[PDB]
Amino acid sequence: SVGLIWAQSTSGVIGRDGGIPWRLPEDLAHFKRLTMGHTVVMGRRTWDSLPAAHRPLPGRRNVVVTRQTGLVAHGAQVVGSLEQALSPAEPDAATWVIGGAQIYALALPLANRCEVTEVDVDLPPEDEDALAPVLDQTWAGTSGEWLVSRSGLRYRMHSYRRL
Ligand SMILES: NC(=O)c1ccc[n+]([C@@H]2O[C@H](COP(=O)([O-])OP(=O)(O)OC[C@H]3O[C@@H](n4cnc5c(N)ncnc54)[C@H](OP(=O)(O)O)[C@@H]3O)[C@@H](O)[C@H]2O)c1
Numbered sequence: 001s002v003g004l005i006w007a008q009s010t011s012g013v014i015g016r017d018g019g020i021p022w023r024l025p026e027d028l029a030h031f032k033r034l035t036m037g038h039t040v041v042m043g044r045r046t047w048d049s050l051p052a053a054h055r056p057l058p059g060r061r062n063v064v065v066t067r068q069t070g071l072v073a074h075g076a077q078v079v080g081s082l083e084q085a086l087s088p089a090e091p092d093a094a095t096w097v098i099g100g101a102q103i104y105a106l107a108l109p110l111a112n113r114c115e116v117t118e119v120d121v122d123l124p125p126e127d128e129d130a131l132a133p134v135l136d137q138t139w140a141g142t143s144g145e146w147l148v149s150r151s152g153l154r155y156r157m158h159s160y161r162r163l
């Protein structure tokens with residue numbers, strides 16, 4: 001099982017200026033609950049984007065997809081392709097692809113699940129933004145209710161499975 005997991009604004013922005021252009025603690029807790037104890041696969045730019053306290057993501061096997069020989073920042077297992085990231089895999093569990101946009105594009109043809117957090121923040125896309133992948137007719141989804149963050153932002157979760 002290969003799952004994509006991401007958070008996006010309603011406009012579809014996932015990344016800006018090498019980070020995430022909102023703060024939503026409830027999404028971080030959701031992300032930890034779904035990924036804890038599993039392999040997480042990410043692109044190298046996302047790896048370098050992690051604050052030092054969160055790199056590597058604790059309690060998870062951190063796999064970084066890169067064309068380089070290796071990385072200056074410690075804690076990852078490097079691979080040269082998504083296929084190398086995905087095999088071998090954890091039994092009875094999902095391998096989670098955790099971004100960014102380039103790695104989501106590579107993984108989308110292979111995924112069987114997407115777990116999306118939608119954040120109701122008004123962020124008109126800017127020229128260099130990373131955007132969420134668009135799901136085609138092979139996906140069926142369900143959506144949770146709108147929730148209110150302690151910070152006041154509305155947010156909700158959507159879950160998609162491959163038909
Ligand atoms: N909102 C969310 O849920 C979420 C989640 C994750 C990330 N983000 C944001 O997304 C942005 C980063 O996304 P991004 O698309 O710019 O970068 P990315 O997908 O994280 O990483 C891109 C890098 O992955 C490597 N790569 C890409 N395709 C490859 C291939 N076919 N084979 C081998 N290596 C390959 C390359 O590393 P090398 O250059 O080292 O070769 C490339 O520079 C940041 O703003 C981050 O904060 C948001």
Ligand SMILES: CCCCCc1nc(N)nc(N)c1OCCCOc1ccccc1CCC(=O)O
Pocket residue numbers: 005006007020024027028031032046049050051054057058097098099116117
């Ligand atoms: C602060 C928002 C964190 C979740 C964003 C997110 N939210 C969802 N729903 N899906 C994602 N793929 C994602 O991105 C993960 C990579 C970025 O992680 C980061 C970044 C910076 C600080 C901390 C972490 C994770 C720490 C941990 O899991 O212990």
